[PDB]
Curated annotation (Swiss-Prot):
Residues 30-41 are extracellular. The modification N6-(retinylidene)lysine is found at residue 54. It comes from the Archaea. It is found in: Cell membrane. Light-driven proton pump. Homotrimer. The gene is bop. It comes from Halobacterium salinarum (strain ATCC 700922 / JCM 11081 / NRC-1) (Halobacterium halobium). The covalent binding of retinal to the apoprotein, bacterioopsin, generates bacteriorhodopsin. The chain crosses the membrane at residues 11-29, 42-61. The chain holds residues 176 to 244 of 262 of the full protein. Belongs to the archaeal/bacterial/fungal opsin family. This is Bacteriorhodopsin.
């Protein structure tokens, strides 16, 4: 190995970036029920989108088969 100036600089950046990305992950673990509120909001929004898309797809399919026959 070599404890170079370049070496130590790059090591510092690596550690800091890793810690940063890990920070929200660790939080979520230590706030499963606590910070559930925002999680619920997002899940609801996503589900609504899913439903509307599914309905649209159904309508398209009906139209297509009618035109074909």
């Amino acid at each position: 190995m070599r404890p170079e100036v370049a070496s130590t600089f790059k090591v510092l950046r690596n550690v800091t970036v890793v810690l940063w990305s890990a920070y929200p992950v660790v939080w979520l673990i230590g706030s499963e029920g606590a910070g559930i509120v925002p999680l619920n909001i997002e899940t609801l929004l996503f589900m609504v989108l899913d439903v509307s898309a599914k309905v649209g797809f159904g309508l398209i399919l009906l139209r297509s088969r009618a035109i074909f026959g």
